[PDB]
Design a protein around this nucleic acid. Structure first.
Lengths: 185, 51, 192, 171, 63, 159
RNA sequence: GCCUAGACCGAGGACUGCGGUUUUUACCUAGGAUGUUGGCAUAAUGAUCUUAAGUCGCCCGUCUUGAAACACGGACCAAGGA
RNA sequence: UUGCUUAAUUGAACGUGGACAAUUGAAUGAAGAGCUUUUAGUGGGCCAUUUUUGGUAAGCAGAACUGGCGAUGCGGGAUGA
RNA sequence: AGCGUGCUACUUAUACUUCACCGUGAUUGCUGUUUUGACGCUUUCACGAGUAGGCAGGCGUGGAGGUCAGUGACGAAGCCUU
């Protein structure tokens, strides 16, 4: 017998492989499993983990975020790495010239990058021109902007959104939401 | 693949403790101590007998 | 080895001289204790259970070295009804480390079969050999914490010859728990 | 138990107010020095304001018998607890060693009074030099001139289960 | 007919210590909720002015 | 009829000390509390305004708000399996500075004072506190202190 | 330090290591059993089934704090059956 | 810095800049820490030590702390949650 | 072969120690020898009770798309059988 100070036979709780069965996504894991194992660069181990992430943990990165990242001091010529989809943003007034490496580009996002003299490469082409991820800048999309997060942790005095089907004056606005109808929480 | 006890295996003992050879060569485990024959209890400590 | 021998001879000489000059030589209190958990893992109150977990005594017949201070003494007092502890001799420490010495390397129990294993994990504390480790344990040194935590808790067997008739009572009243102070060596010889 | 006689000397822990505390000595009959030092504190705390935490053990020494091969009669003064109260007795023993007579005492009071080791305090163990110091008849009868006695009805311990010859008890 | 157990705290500390008892996290900047409004009102101007002063300070050594 | 009012069970906790009734000495009203100070809570029965609940009697916390006659104290209370920060408004009569700060603040200055000197003298010094170690060897001299022999005493009734 | 009696096991499968003797770019007891001999291959050996012996073994499902229960359902079998 | 505060250049709060490095300031330990979503069953309990209320008491009724049984076999108590 | 007490040896749990094998979790390494398996191979260490319940990997039945140019009147399917 043993006095177990912790729970036994506990899995790490992290993804060790992609849930997807895309054969091409698995070639990227194969390529970055080798680089993470054989290079000892911190960038390689970060990319390998991001390839495992689910869809909601890889939110789209707009072409505006990349614009804002390229505007950092000394980051105008860094290689933008996005493990996910790069989408278009019609709100931009101008886009610079830069190389962006991404899993996927929308038609609009790819168009604007090329129209401004930039280059849209995939993550395998990145491993050629940067096997160590030299001079890169990883950009991630906003995770908490998802609509499902609005309702997480709903409760009294929390300020989260109720899980409701219809919005209007007759739908959960009277008692508990108004001090004229009893109380407000 | 197999732990060997240095207290049974001489080669493992020499591998771990090179000084062991000297300890055996100098008979350190049975070394005499040179001293005179003295009895320092004849005085007051003889109150162990009675007090 | 030379300093062990000279320390013993100096202590004996001091005792003899104090006997000569109508004095009394009071020996230095022990600075190291060996603690063996001799009680199973069932029906333990929360406080001694937590104390035993902090001493890394998570199984029966498991032994560990503890440097005696007020804090650790009060720790051991809470675990007294479940452990037997005492002041170990040098030969006991050497036999323990040689036969049952394992180090904690990357949270793995690795046998101390070569001085390279000890060096790779305790070189920054100037421990280059099994003898360096034994010396650090015996004469409780500056790096005692690291060396003792590097040692995996010793896994002794049941005594050859058994315990007394009933264990779970204090050694003073014919049991086995508590402090026996030099008889830890006979027990460890039974158990190692 | 199987006992030894120990000298234990102790004192209060030195204080800046009291820098040379008085040394106290006791003769303790214990199986080992771990119990001997424990029994010492047990009797000091019954006689003086001291504890193990606030005190110090100075010396522990075995007291060997002066004349281990000389037959003596020991008078022992006792203080034991019964189921009802606390009593004093004085009992006498014939033995060659001071320790063994105490060992006889512990067996004796267990047999005749159901008194456990924890229930007994030995106030004093004294050698009886003179014959008139003997008060108890169960030891006085062995001090007579030219004492002889046979051992009738000798029982011989047999190694085998079956003996082919009739048993005998001569001696 | 329905006399049952009224109340007990038996097993309640065990359930508390399975995942607890977790201490609250500390942060460099605690919230100013419940702080006196007069101090809170003034603390706004003091921080606003400090940001202006630094912005000028970084201006002289930048361009 | 169970009763669980606000001040239930405070018969002795909210009593004044023996021969300490009446007016409050004004050192209470002269002490200065700053946000971030560590203070002890001890309800004074003679002031019924700004009185803490009986739970906070004897608890220590951090001052986070200072008002005209009160301080806001933060207490962590175990509610189930976690702690909750409680924000209690207390008149300063119920509040006292915690003395645990000053001893540690002294050690902060003492440690710095000792450390800078060791650099000055070209040596090094160890600043961590140490638990009381077992005592070293010593020699007991017996001039005037020949050991007294003690024996257990006979039983005797003393009524 | 030395001698000495017995029991159980032999995972691994080119080399790599740490040591020792160095008489040596050699050998070793030093990162896990080999050598030799006899017998058998119409069999020594192993497995299963039936049975004897020794020892242990209360009738399942269920509700229940608690079932072998003198609590309830169940004679048996097939097919259907949530 | 402030519109708060002071008779005030006093403060209060937040800062700029500078010094103090592995004894960065007790012990021991750490199959790592933190965070989130979602959902199951459960919401009849009982027993032992110790504290304890009602009762003459109860294999009675009701509480406190811990450990157990339930949910658990195994060695001992012949048999037994 | 009772009671009190002490000692010596001895008996044996699914407990402990060493070893083997299984699984789970973690962990070492593996593409200029990656070579037709990298959802793989490989090194090491620890762990293994379990109702209600949860999750994972599998086994089996009727029918469907593809494939085995599959089996079969020289005997399919079914059924019985140390």
């Amino acid at each position: 017998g043993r006095d177990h100070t912790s729970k036994q036979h506990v899995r790490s709780g992290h993804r060790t492989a992609p849930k997807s069965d895309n054969v091409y996504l698995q070639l990227l894991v194969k390529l970055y499993s080798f680089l993470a194992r054989r290079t000892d660069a911190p960038f390689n181990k970060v990319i390998l983990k991001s390839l495992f992430l689910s869809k909601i943990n890889r939110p789209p990165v707009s072409v505006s975020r990349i614009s804002r990242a390229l505007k950092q001091k000394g980051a105008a010529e860094k290689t933008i790495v996005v493990v996910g989809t790069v989408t278009d943003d019609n709100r931009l007034l101008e886009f610079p010239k830069a190389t962006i490496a991404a899993l996927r580009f929308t038609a609009g996002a790819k168009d604007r990058i090329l129209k401004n003299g930039g280059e849209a490469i995939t993550l395998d082409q990145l491993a050629l021109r940067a096997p160590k991820g030299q001079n890169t800048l990883i950009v991630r999309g906003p995770r908490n902007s998802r609509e499902a997060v609005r309702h997480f942790g709903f409760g009294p005095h929390k300020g989260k959104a109720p899980r409701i089907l219809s919005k209007g004056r007759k739908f959960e606005r009277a008692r508990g939401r108004r001090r004229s109808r009893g109380f407000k929480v | 693949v197999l732990k060997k006890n240095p207290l049974k295996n001489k080669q493992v003992l020499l591998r771990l403790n090179p000084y062991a050879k000297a300890y055996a060569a100098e008979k350190v485990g049975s070394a005499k101590v040179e001293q005179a024959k003295v009895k320092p209890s004849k005085g007051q400590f003889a109150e162990v007998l009675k007090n | 080895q030379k300093e062990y021998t000279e320390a013993e001879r100096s202590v004996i000489k001091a005792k003899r001289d104090a006997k000569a000059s109508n004095s009394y030589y009071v020996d230095a209190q022990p600075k190291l204790v060996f603690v063996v958990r001799i009680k199973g893992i069932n029906k333990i109150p929360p406080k001694p259970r937590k104390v035993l977990q902090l001493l890394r005594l998570t199984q029966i017949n498991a032994g560990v070295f503890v440097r005696l201070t007020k804090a650790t003494s009060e720790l051991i007092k809470l675990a007294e009804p479940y452990v037997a502890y005492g002041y170990p001799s040098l030969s006991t420490i050497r036999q323990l480390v040689y036969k049952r010495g394992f180090g904690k390397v990357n949270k793995q129990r690795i046998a101390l079969s070569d001085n390279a294993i000890i060096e790779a994990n305790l070189g920054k504390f100037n421990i280059l050999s099994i003898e360096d480790l034994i010396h650090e344990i015996y004469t409780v040194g500056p790096n005692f914490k690291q060396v003792s935590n590097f040692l995996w808790p010793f896994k002794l067997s049941n005594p050859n010859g058994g315990f007394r008739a009933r264990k779970f009572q204090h050694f003073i009243q014919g049991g086995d728990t508590g402090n026996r102070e030099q008889f830890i060596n006979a027990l460890v010889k039974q158990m190692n | 138990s199987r006992l030894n006689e120990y000298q234990v000397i102790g004192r209060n822990l030195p204080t800046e107010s009291v820098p040379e505390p008085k040394l106290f000595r006791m003769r303790i009959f214990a199986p080992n020095t771990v119990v001997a030092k424990s029994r010492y504190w047990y009797f000091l705390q019954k006689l003086h304001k001291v504890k193990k935490a606030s005190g110090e053990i100075v010396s522990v020494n075995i007291i060997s018998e002066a004349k281990p091969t000389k037959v003596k009669t020991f008078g022992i003064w006792l203080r034991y607890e019964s189921r009802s109260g606390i009593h004093n007795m004085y009992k006498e023993y014939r033995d060659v060693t001071r320790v063994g007579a105490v060992e006889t005492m512990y067996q004796d009071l267990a047999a005749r009074h159901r008194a456990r080791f924890r229930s007994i305090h030995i106030l004093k163990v004294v050698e009886l030099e003179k014959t008139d110091d003997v008060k108890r008849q169960y030891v006085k009868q062995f001090l007579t001139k030219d004492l002889k006695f046979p051992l009738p009805h000798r029982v011989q311990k047999s190694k085998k289960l079956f003996q082919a010859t009739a048993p005998t008890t001569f001696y | 007919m329905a006399k049952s157990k009224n109340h007990t705290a038996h097993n309640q500390t065990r359930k508390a210590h399975r995942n607890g008892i977790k201490k609250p996290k500390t942060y460099k900047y605690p919230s100013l909720k419940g702080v006196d409004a007069k101090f809170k009102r003034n603390h706004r101007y003091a921080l606003h002015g400090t940001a202006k002063a630094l912005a000028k300070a970084r201006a002289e050594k930048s361009a | 009829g169970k009763s669980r009012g606000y001040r239930s069970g405070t018969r002795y906790a909210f009593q004044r000390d023996f021969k300490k009734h009446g007016a409050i000495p004004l050192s209470t009203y002269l002490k200065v509390y700053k946000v971030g100070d560590i203070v002890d809570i001890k309800a004074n029965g003679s002031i019924q305004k700004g009185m803490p609940h009986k739970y906070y009697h004897g608890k220590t916390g951090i001052v986070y708000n200072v008002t005209k006659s009160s301080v806001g104290v933060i207490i962590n209370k175990v509610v189930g399996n976690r702690y909750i920060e409680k924000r209690v408004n207390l008149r300063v009569e119920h509040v006292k500075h915690s003395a645990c700060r000053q001893e540690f603040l002294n050690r902060v200055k003492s440690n710095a004072a000792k450390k800078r000197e060791a650099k000055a003298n070209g040596e090094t010094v160890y600043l961590k506190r140490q638990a009381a170690k077992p005592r070293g060897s010593r020699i007991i001299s017996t001039e005037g202190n020949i050991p007294q022999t003690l024996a257990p005493v006979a039983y005797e009734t003393f009524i």
